[PDB]
Amino acid sequence: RTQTGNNTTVNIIISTVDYLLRVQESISDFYWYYSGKDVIDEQGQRNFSKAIQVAKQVFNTLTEYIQGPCTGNQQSLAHSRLWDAVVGFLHVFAHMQMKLSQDSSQIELLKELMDLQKDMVVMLLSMLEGNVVNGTIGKQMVDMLVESSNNVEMILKFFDMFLKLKDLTSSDTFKEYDPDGKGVISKRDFHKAMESHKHYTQSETEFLLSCAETDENETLDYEEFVKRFHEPAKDIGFNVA
């Protein structure tokens, strides 16, 4: 951060924050390009994968800068452009979670992106490490959450739905909806399963059915469904909680 002896000092930490802002802007622009389009092609998949890996490495480097009670680096990052980058990343995360989950071909991209969100939340926790009651860093994060209120609500609703999925699957009503241990339940039986569970609204029900894979036999496998969604929701949403 500061080279004491040297005649000139370069703030590598602030430079890292600037590069993170640039890569966040690039990712946001690429999303805006792929927003109207229904499905992202393979080249877009590869480009998102590379950009997400680069951003993940940058977040890991920032987290290693902050870890420990490194007050100087904490204050330098608090008085920097990191908050705007995190806002843009939250925007991208929420909208990308909406768009990718519906399509089956985007599972690996969704996993990589949710890992990126996990690393971002890890960096934020490293920020809050050593924070006193009513601290400047925590107040700044609350201000950032206020700025990004809507997409945070989207992410929380996403995690809420894919967490209630496990309870619905474990519910006995689901057991007599699919009495056999075969593990496949029809679309109609599943829909009346939300209706009996009553913890899912109509919009939640329709969105989850859309995310569910549709077979010609129309019997989705709830085991693979929950394996796809609930456990990643558990892992990444624990950090947010």
Map 149-190 to HEC letters: HHHHHHHHHHHHHHHHHHHHHHCHHHHHHCCCCCCEEEHHHH
Reported as half-sphere exposure (CB side, CA atoms, 13 A), residue 91 has a value of 18
What resolution in Å is listed for this PDB structure?
3.7
Cβ–Cβ < 8 Å for 92, 31: yes
Cβ–Cβ < 8 Å for 40, 101: no
Q: Identify the experimental approach.
A: cryo-EM
* Other CB atoms within 10 A of residue 92 CB: 22
Between CA 79 and CA 193 the distance in angstroms is: 50
Cβ–Cβ < 8 Å for 189, 217: no
- Report the Cα 227 to chain-centroid distance in Å: 17
Helix (H, G, I), strand (E, B) or coil at 69: coil
Between CA 29 and CA 128 the distance in angstroms is: 29
Closest C-alpha among 14, 109, 9, 134 to residue 62: 14
